[PDB]
Ligand binder design. Sequence first.
Ligand SMILES: [Mg+2]
Ligand SMILES: [Mg+2]
Ligand SMILES: [Mg+2]
Ligand SMILES: [Mg+2]
Ligand SMILES: [Mg+2]
Ligand SMILES: [Mg+2]
Ligand SMILES: [Mg+2]
Ligand SMILES: [Mg+2]
Ligand SMILES: [Mg+2]
Ligand SMILES: [Mg+2]
Ligand SMILES: [Mg+2]
Ligand SMILES: [Mg+2]
Ligand SMILES: [Mg+2]
Ligand SMILES: [Mg+2]
Ligand SMILES: [Mg+2]
Ligand SMILES: [Mg+2]
Ligand SMILES: [Mg+2]
Ligand SMILES: [Mg+2]
Ligand SMILES: [Mg+2]
Ligand SMILES: [Mg+2]
Ligand SMILES: [Mg+2]
Ligand SMILES: [Mg+2]
Ligand SMILES: [Mg+2]
Ligand SMILES: [Mg+2]
Ligand SMILES: [Mg+2]
Ligand SMILES: [Mg+2]
Ligand SMILES: [Mg+2]
Ligand SMILES: [Mg+2]
Ligand SMILES: [Mg+2]
Ligand SMILES: [Mg+2]
Ligand SMILES: [Mg+2]
Ligand SMILES: [Mg+2]
Ligand SMILES: [Mg+2]
Ligand SMILES: [Mg+2]
Ligand SMILES: [Mg+2]
Ligand SMILES: [Mg+2]
Ligand SMILES: [Mg+2]
Ligand SMILES: [Mg+2]
Ligand SMILES: [Mg+2]
Ligand SMILES: [Mg+2]
Ligand SMILES: [Mg+2]
Ligand SMILES: [Mg+2]
Ligand SMILES: [Mg+2]
Ligand SMILES: [Mg+2]
Ligand SMILES: [Mg+2]
Ligand SMILES: [Mg+2]
Ligand SMILES: [Mg+2]
Ligand SMILES: [Mg+2]
Ligand SMILES: [Mg+2]
Ligand SMILES: [Mg+2]
Ligand SMILES: [Mg+2]
Ligand SMILES: [Mg+2]
Ligand SMILES: [Mg+2]
Ligand SMILES: [Mg+2]
Ligand SMILES: [Mg+2]
Ligand SMILES: [Mg+2]
Ligand SMILES: [Mg+2]
Ligand SMILES: [Mg+2]
Ligand SMILES: [Mg+2]
Ligand SMILES: [Mg+2]
Ligand SMILES: [Mg+2]
Ligand SMILES: [Mg+2]
Ligand SMILES: [Mg+2]
Ligand SMILES: [Mg+2]
Ligand SMILES: [Mg+2]
Ligand SMILES: [Mg+2]
Ligand SMILES: [Mg+2]
Ligand SMILES: [Mg+2]
Ligand SMILES: [Mg+2]
Ligand SMILES: [Mg+2]
Ligand SMILES: [Mg+2]
Ligand SMILES: [Mg+2]
Ligand SMILES: [Mg+2]
Ligand SMILES: [Mg+2]
Ligand SMILES: [Mg+2]
Ligand SMILES: [Mg+2]
Ligand SMILES: [Mg+2]
Ligand SMILES: [Mg+2]
Ligand SMILES: [Mg+2]
Ligand SMILES: [Mg+2]
Ligand SMILES: [Mg+2]
Ligand SMILES: [Mg+2]
Ligand SMILES: [Mg+2]
Ligand SMILES: [Mg+2]
Length: 75
Amino acid sequence: AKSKNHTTHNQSRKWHRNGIKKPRSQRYESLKGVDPKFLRNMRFAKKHNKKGLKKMQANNAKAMAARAEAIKALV
RNA sequence: ACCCACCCGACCCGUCUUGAAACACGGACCAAGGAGUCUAACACGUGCGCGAGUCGGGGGCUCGCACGAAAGCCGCCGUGGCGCAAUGAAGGUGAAGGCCGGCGCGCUCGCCGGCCGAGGUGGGAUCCCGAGGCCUCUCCAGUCCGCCGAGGGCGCACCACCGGCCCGUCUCGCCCGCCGCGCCGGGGAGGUGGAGCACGAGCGCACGUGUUAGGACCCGAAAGAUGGUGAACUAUGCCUGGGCAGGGCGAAGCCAGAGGAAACUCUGGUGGAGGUCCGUAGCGGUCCUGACGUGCAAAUCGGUCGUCCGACCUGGGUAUAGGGGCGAAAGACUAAUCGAACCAUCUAGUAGCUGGUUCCCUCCGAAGUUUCCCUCAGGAUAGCUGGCGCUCUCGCACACGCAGUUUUAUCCGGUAAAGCGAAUGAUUAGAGGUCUUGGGGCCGAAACGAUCUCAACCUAUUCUCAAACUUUAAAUGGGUAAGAAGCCCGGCUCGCUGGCGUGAGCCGGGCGUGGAAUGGAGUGCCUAGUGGGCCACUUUUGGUAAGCAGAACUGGCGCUGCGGGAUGAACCGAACGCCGGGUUAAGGCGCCCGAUGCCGACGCUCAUCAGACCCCAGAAAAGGUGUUGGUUGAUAUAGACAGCAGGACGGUGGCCAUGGAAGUCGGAAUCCGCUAAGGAGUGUGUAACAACUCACCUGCCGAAUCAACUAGCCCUGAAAAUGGAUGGCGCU
RNA sequence: CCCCGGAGCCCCGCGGACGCUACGCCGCGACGAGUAGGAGGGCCGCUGCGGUGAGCCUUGAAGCCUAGGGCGCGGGCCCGGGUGGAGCCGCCGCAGGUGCAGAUCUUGGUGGUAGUAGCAAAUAUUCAAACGAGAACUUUGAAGGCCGAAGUGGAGAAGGGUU
RNA sequence: CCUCUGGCAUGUUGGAACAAUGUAGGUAAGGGAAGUCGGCAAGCCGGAUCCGUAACUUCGGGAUAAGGAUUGGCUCUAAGG
RNA sequence: AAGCAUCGCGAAGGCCCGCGGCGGGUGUUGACGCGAUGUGAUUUCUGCCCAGUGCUCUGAAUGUCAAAGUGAAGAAAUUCAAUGAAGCGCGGGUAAACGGCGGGAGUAACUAUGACUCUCUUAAGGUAGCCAAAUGCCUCGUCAUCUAAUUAGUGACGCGCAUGAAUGGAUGAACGAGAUUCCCACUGUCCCUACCUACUAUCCAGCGAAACCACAGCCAAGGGAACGGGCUUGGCGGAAUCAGCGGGGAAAGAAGACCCUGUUGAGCUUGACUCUAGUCUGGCACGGUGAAGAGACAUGUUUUUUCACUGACCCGGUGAGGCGG
RNA sequence: GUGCCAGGUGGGGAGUUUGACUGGGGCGGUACACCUGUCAAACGGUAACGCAGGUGUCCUAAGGCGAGCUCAGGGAGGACAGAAACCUCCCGUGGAGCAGAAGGGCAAAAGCUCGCUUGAUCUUGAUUUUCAGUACGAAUACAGACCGUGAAAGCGGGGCCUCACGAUCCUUCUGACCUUUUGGGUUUUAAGCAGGAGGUGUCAGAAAAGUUACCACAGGGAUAACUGGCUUGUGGCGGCCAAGCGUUCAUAGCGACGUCGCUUUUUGAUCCUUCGAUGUCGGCUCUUCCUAUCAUUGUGAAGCAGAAUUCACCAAGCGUUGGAUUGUUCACCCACUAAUAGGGAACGUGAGCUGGGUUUAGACCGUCGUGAGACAGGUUAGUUUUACCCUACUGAUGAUGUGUUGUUGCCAUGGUAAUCCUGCUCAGUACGAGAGGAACCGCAGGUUCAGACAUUUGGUGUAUGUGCUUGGCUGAGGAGCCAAUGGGGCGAAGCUACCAUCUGUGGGAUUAUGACUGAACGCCUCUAAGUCAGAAUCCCGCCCAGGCGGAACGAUACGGCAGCGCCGC
Ligand SMILES: [Mg+2]
Ligand SMILES: [Mg+2]
Ligand SMILES: [Mg+2]
Ligand SMILES: [Mg+2]
Ligand SMILES: [Mg+2]
Ligand SMILES: [Mg+2]
Ligand SMILES: [Mg+2]
Ligand SMILES: [Mg+2]
Ligand SMILES: [Mg+2]
Ligand SMILES: [Mg+2]
Ligand SMILES: [Mg+2]
Ligand SMILES: [Mg+2]
Ligand SMILES: [Mg+2]
Ligand SMILES: [Mg+2]
Ligand SMILES: [Mg+2]
Ligand SMILES: [Mg+2]
Ligand SMILES: [Mg+2]
Ligand SMILES: [Mg+2]
Ligand SMILES: [Mg+2]
Ligand SMILES: [Mg+2]
Ligand SMILES: [Mg+2]
Ligand SMILES: [Mg+2]
Ligand SMILES: [Mg+2]
Ligand SMILES: [Mg+2]
Ligand SMILES: [Mg+2]
Ligand SMILES: [Mg+2]
Ligand SMILES: [Mg+2]
Ligand SMILES: [Mg+2]
Ligand SMILES: [Mg+2]
Ligand SMILES: [Mg+2]
Ligand SMILES: [Mg+2]
Ligand SMILES: [Mg+2]
Ligand SMILES: [Mg+2]
Ligand SMILES: [Mg+2]
Ligand SMILES: [Mg+2]
Ligand SMILES: [Mg+2]
Ligand SMILES: [Mg+2]
Ligand SMILES: [Mg+2]
Ligand SMILES: [Mg+2]
Ligand SMILES: [Mg+2]
Ligand SMILES: [Mg+2]
Ligand SMILES: [Mg+2]
Ligand SMILES: [Mg+2]
Ligand SMILES: [Mg+2]
Ligand SMILES: [Mg+2]
Ligand SMILES: [Mg+2]
Ligand SMILES: [Mg+2]
Ligand SMILES: [Mg+2]
Ligand SMILES: [Mg+2]
Ligand SMILES: [Mg+2]
Ligand SMILES: [Mg+2]
Ligand SMILES: [Mg+2]
Ligand SMILES: [Mg+2]
Ligand SMILES: [Mg+2]
Ligand SMILES: [Mg+2]
Ligand SMILES: [Mg+2]
Ligand SMILES: [Mg+2]
Ligand SMILES: [Mg+2]
Ligand SMILES: [Mg+2]
Ligand SMILES: [Mg+2]
Ligand SMILES: [Mg+2]
Ligand SMILES: [Mg+2]
Ligand SMILES: [Mg+2]
Ligand SMILES: [Mg+2]
Ligand SMILES: [Mg+2]
Ligand SMILES: [Mg+2]
Ligand SMILES: [Mg+2]
Ligand SMILES: [Mg+2]
Ligand SMILES: [Mg+2]
Ligand SMILES: [Mg+2]
Ligand SMILES: [Mg+2]
Ligand SMILES: [Mg+2]
Ligand SMILES: [Mg+2]
Ligand SMILES: [Mg+2]
Ligand SMILES: [Mg+2]
Ligand SMILES: [Mg+2]
Ligand SMILES: [Mg+2]
Ligand SMILES: [Mg+2]
Ligand SMILES: [Mg+2]
Ligand SMILES: [Mg+2]
Ligand SMILES: [Mg+2]
Ligand SMILES: [Mg+2]
Ligand SMILES: [Mg+2]
Ligand SMILES: [Mg+2]
């Protein structure tokens, strides 16, 4: 009593009932499996972003004032 | 709705199965009975109550309970359960951070005051603000009401990402603490394991589905175990009783007579031995393979047989009992039961295996493939199914994303083909080459001397090949990409990287349709059946082949009716709510049978076996002046072609072959003369000739003639057993 | 430039269905094969319980039968007539030992087979009479037969248990 | 096998026919195992008296070996107490 | 089965039962007996093989071998040591124990066989006998005989697939409901069938079952789960029945004995795995008295060896009848 | 001795086990865990007991660096030295080597030779490959240590890459001033935590021998042993071609090397059907079909003079026998014959038989097995059920119709029958050198088959006919009876036998074939239109049955109630 041994006959059909969906792409994928030495350093960089805040805020206010002067000169 | 008629349709259900009207099983008929239950445990969903709680048990207080064995209440209301905290094997430890100011050297470390208090990015239903319209019976003013709303905000839930905190663990480090300064205790930085925290969601009750444990959907073993009953049958022992015609053979002992010298021997009697013979009753049971075979009989009957004074037959009593007895041993017998009796129980024993499994409509609707399994008639796990949803989207003039497509870019490929004067391997032929050298020759003493030769090698060529070769190289095919998660500016962070710079991560602005066609998307939980398959196109391996076995690809059948294919799983057409009209497909249109009952068109073909439609149910090589087309060549007025009539020679017994071939078993040759012209000969035949026969030309007759291929129909090739099938009748 | 308790109405913002069991009612499109399997709805069906129908019932309940009348796609249902002779149903809830064609199913019943197979072992019966409703079979008589003293005869044992 | 003593009514029925198949009996011309797996089945033989008796042998048997003849009825004779 | 032949046992024994007993059977017995096996009267034989597996005999000369006991170190649990029973090993016997019993080459003044020789080999290498046997594949062996004809029968032959000596060989009168072959007789066995009898079957009166049963019942062909009663296409089809018949209903009978599957069994086997009654050995206990001596350690202890003793314990006898002084 | 422990022995006894896949199973293999090339249809992925192979290791270097070299092969040289020793020059895309299979990869290397070495070390996660996208193994990229090597850049955490390996439990070793060893403390011990090792090859991992013919149970047509299907290799039969054979001559008869077919009376494949059973070989008996024709009829051919013959055509009407051995099929032999052709029907035919053989159980022998047991090795003994149903067939009553009845008839359709031989004659003739040796027409008979019949012969005989005879019984005689038909002679009638006797017929159409006239094709041709002869064939005749088919004719209900036939209206 020998069987059928293997096949792939009805399988494509079976797969395509429910699509063959592409793998759901997000923005902001994880940093799992990224070269450790990198990840330390981007972690440290992220740690000290709040250091150098007061400088950054002022720079944007100076930029915003320069934009407001430019738009007044245009109008 | 009862009966009858007629036309068309129409095989018997159930079931296992790839496939059932089956020569697969179950089913004579009717009634009643008859199979997914209950308990427990889990999980998810749903409904209700309360909610950081919830809870009810168990107990108690209220009644003789009619209704109550209820109902109510309880600092027991919470002992306690579950929940509200984890993590570590454990000793144990145990979920906060930020900011600001100050003091220690701001040392991305240690200590003291103030403020905020569960971080941030992107997307987010929804709210909020809202420039601005858009009018009002006039020109302006102008509060009220809307409608829309560009633009901008707070952003639930949820998702993705990055930070953070707790426990385990590692690595590196530097400080704090005190009743006990210690092999004491506490912290930091950076990874990494945790069923964690990051303003809670549980508890109880109820219903549903699923999964289990239980007799566990219902029915079914062969077995296993405990405790009992039987020797009235039969097996063997023992006790006490009963039973066995008539004949044959004639053992020991005995007598007489005769012989013998003795030993003893003969002859005639008598005698009546024996697991002796015949043969009755008895006991048995050979053959007829007789009778019977739903019997007279759950083993009988008839004849024929074996034995019939002995290991004989036989009554009653008595002994031996179940892994035990008893056995002249056949695994025989042990109450119609024996390769382990019977009875009751354990027991509703177990069953991956048969069988069955009860009303209607509606909607969705499979699989026979995965990996694992003492797995291959079963499970597990993926897959395919359903159910419950949720989150968003906008036809409410104002859309994003997704696809069994295609387009434009761009990579991938080594199959078909092709190639072998390219590699690898195979392989033919001759040219050329003392390449090498040989082995065999012939002419050489021998000599790359001359001449051949065959070996391998080589120089150009040449024949033919490859699933496990290839320089080339398709078609079909597989990725990506075709924008807001995108571009373009400005600035900050780094313990990484570094002459300066990289690269990454952060903030803050600035810019909108970015190929065709179509379509509303996303997302989570429970989840059944299935895990025997088969069939066709094309591709394809094994095999002589198979209605054989095995893959790929799509589509079928299985699950599925309907028109066609006469008939039919699977072919072709087409996929079904119940009906009227119309129109089609694939198929048809002599009659069966709806439609050609057309003045249908043009050919082909006659068969003493005609032929007549995918799958398909049947023929080949090879033949045929049968007939019809082609193709190529001829021929012929220098009047042919056939049809009849006249000659077929000589050089020449040509040469090889003698065994005879002067043309003639065969073969190398193979030309001249006469010529009008005859082959050194097509055959007949001869031992060998001879003789005969087979061009070139005329005479007659009077226009086409003839050859070789080729392909259409038809025919030969063509033989099977019940009588027979283009479906039938038939048809020219 | 006036008020609908009155414009008279194709729109009426003063009040609003014949319609509105909002688990209702209505409108537009599309679609409809189905085993195994899943889910939904059943004013389908059975039996019992709490409610409820001032239900039904000897002026006839249940069941049974019906070439009667109907409804529903269907599960089924309702009426008429007959039969019967004592109980029974509708609705809202709850509960289940809840729906059969099959199981070589269980128990009971009934057919076809069929007036069929069959009533054939062991030689044998006949005549007259009696009784009697009735005689192939009883009894009596007569004849013809068999068992043929290892008996189909005459007596026990065991077993039966009144034969 | 037939009879007396004693006992029965032909074994759970009767009648009418006399087909095929059977079951149980018989018989067959000529041949005689040609039949058939095989003389299965049936047939031959059979009592008694008188003769006659092989191979072989465990000397006992074989042995009713085989093979032959006779057998009735009647009327007498002889022999046995 | 008689006959033959092995084997165990002198009774605190052999063999065996039993759950247990100062239990029981053999046994009311004693080797001319009890118990266990083979072979199978007589006659005549009974070859070789002790390598294998069995069984058995011996046993400080001795490898291993348990618990207890002895010593050792350790705080102790302990470990280590020496000691050392049967059993295995080690060494003898045993085949009327299971069983076993060869293969190459060459060789004789015609050829052929091979007396003879040469090897290689085992525990021996099949002896006497016997044979195509109930044992021989090839096989219907070859020769003879028996028949007209013989895969049969008999007699011979023997590199015998794969004979063979109490796994008994060869024989053999008598006997056999045993297996064959031939001959004589006899026959319906047959050529070749026929006629007769009785009881049936038949028809009737009375009486009266059963199995079986989806529906049913005329064929050919087709297709079809590849042999249809039903379907397609053809042939066709006429009530109700009687006696027969065995073609068909793939007729009935019985959930296939075969075969295969099942993680279903049972009977039996053993070199399966895991145990176990029984048995053999060692230890401790009931277990005492005396003598003697002997080693080992130590400078008393332990081991005890042998020889007595009787009081436990046992056995036998008896109507416990005379015992010791 | 008993009690209790210890070790041995212990199929006497118990319990249990005795894989899987598999063109049924068993035997054999391993396709059971891995790897290469192919299969594979140019992404990947893919099957079979597909193909060709490899694996259970090997390495202290064959691992890691760095340096330097260049390999196979060939040419040309050089004392001994030759095809091969050593040296030297040239060419050399790798044709070598790189542990092993193969594939890839590799030249100032991944090869060889040196120098120094232990990156084959310690430790987190991520990823790939198998994948369920779990494990194992194997690998990839990092990251942190500590090293190696190199001037350095770098490379290196095993082997250039693709295979070489193993869970839970248990053990063992290594590791930390580690945790626990529970009323506390110290110490041994044990228990944890983390990493290696001891193995499961049936490789995601039970601990495991047979036998059963004394057997059982659940099932299976998922699967064998028949038929039947498909196929036809194999067997059987038949073409085509034509090198040869046939003295000569390819083809009278043959036919190599090649080739194309049919057949399912061979055997295989295969497994579709049947395992809630389709009775498993042979023989007997009986019917029917096929033809691939042995004989018989009619014919063509010859290497046919005659006789004998083989080759072919129409053709299956009619035949195809008796025995010996064997269970046989098959085989062989004897005999006859005209001939002793071949098959089919579920390998026709078991409710038809038989049962000899296969194939239960009883037994023997050989070989095999320790044994239970085994043996397409031999032997012997071994239960063959049921029909009354339906159909089919056989015969038997009937049926509807015709007004009823009877008569004598016709005939639709079915069936169907004759066969072959000898002798005589032709005739010792044709023919032939002879040897030998036919035929047509006649005539006489016989075989097998069919249909009858009984005068005769035979058989039967229960006329229970008539004798005769046994045993018994009616007292005897006479007359009888009984003994399942007492026995036996003879035997009427009647059945009945190649065991007696009789009878068995004629046409038509044509087939194969051979011919006519005669074109096609100025001739010739059997043919194309036309015509002839023609047969065991076929159809009818005769012969049998006689239709839900008819025919002519007869009589048609006196009656006691009757009832009808015509005619006309
Ligand atoms: Mg499968
Ligand atoms: Mg099944
Ligand atoms: Mg099947
Ligand atoms: Mg069905
Ligand atoms: Mg069928
Ligand atoms: Mg079944
Ligand atoms: Mg049935
Ligand atoms: Mg019911
Ligand atoms: Mg819930
Ligand atoms: Mg679940
Ligand atoms: Mg359950
Ligand atoms: Mg049960
Ligand atoms: Mg058991
Ligand atoms: Mg019998
Ligand atoms: Mg009968
Ligand atoms: Mg009777
Ligand atoms: Mg048993
Ligand atoms: Mg049950
Ligand atoms: Mg299973
Ligand atoms: Mg759905
Ligand atoms: Mg490829
Ligand atoms: Mg190619
Ligand atoms: Mg299955
Ligand atoms: Mg298959
Ligand atoms: Mg199915
Ligand atoms: Mg539907
Ligand atoms: Mg369903
Ligand atoms: Mg009453
Ligand atoms: Mg109830
Ligand atoms: Mg019912
Ligand atoms: Mg009757
Ligand atoms: Mg009496
Ligand atoms: Mg009688
Ligand atoms: Mg009577
Ligand atoms: Mg009686
Ligand atoms: Mg006779
Ligand atoms: Mg014969
Ligand atoms: Mg014979
Ligand atoms: Mg006899
Ligand atoms: Mg004799
Ligand atoms: Mg012996
Ligand atoms: Mg020995
Ligand atoms: Mg043996
Ligand atoms: Mg010998
Ligand atoms: Mg004979
Ligand atoms: Mg002999
Ligand atoms: Mg022997
Ligand atoms: Mg001996
Ligand atoms: Mg022997
Ligand atoms: Mg049928
Ligand atoms: Mg029949
Ligand atoms: Mg049957
Ligand atoms: Mg079965
Ligand atoms: Mg069974
Ligand atoms: Mg299994
Ligand atoms: Mg068992
Ligand atoms: Mg063992
Ligand atoms: Mg056992
Ligand atoms: Mg298997
Ligand atoms: Mg591809
Ligand atoms: Mg280098
Ligand atoms: Mg290397
Ligand atoms: Mg590193
Ligand atoms: Mg303490
Ligand atoms: Mg046996
Ligand atoms: Mg067997
Ligand atoms: Mg036996
Ligand atoms: Mg099958
Ligand atoms: Mg020639
Ligand atoms: Mg077959
Ligand atoms: Mg049958
Ligand atoms: Mg023919
Ligand atoms: Mg047959
Ligand atoms: Mg039959
Ligand atoms: Mg039979
Ligand atoms: Mg037999
Ligand atoms: Mg037997
Ligand atoms: Mg009858
Ligand atoms: Mg007288
Ligand atoms: Mg009598
Ligand atoms: Mg003609
Ligand atoms: Mg004519
Ligand atoms: Mg004629
Ligand atoms: Mg006729």
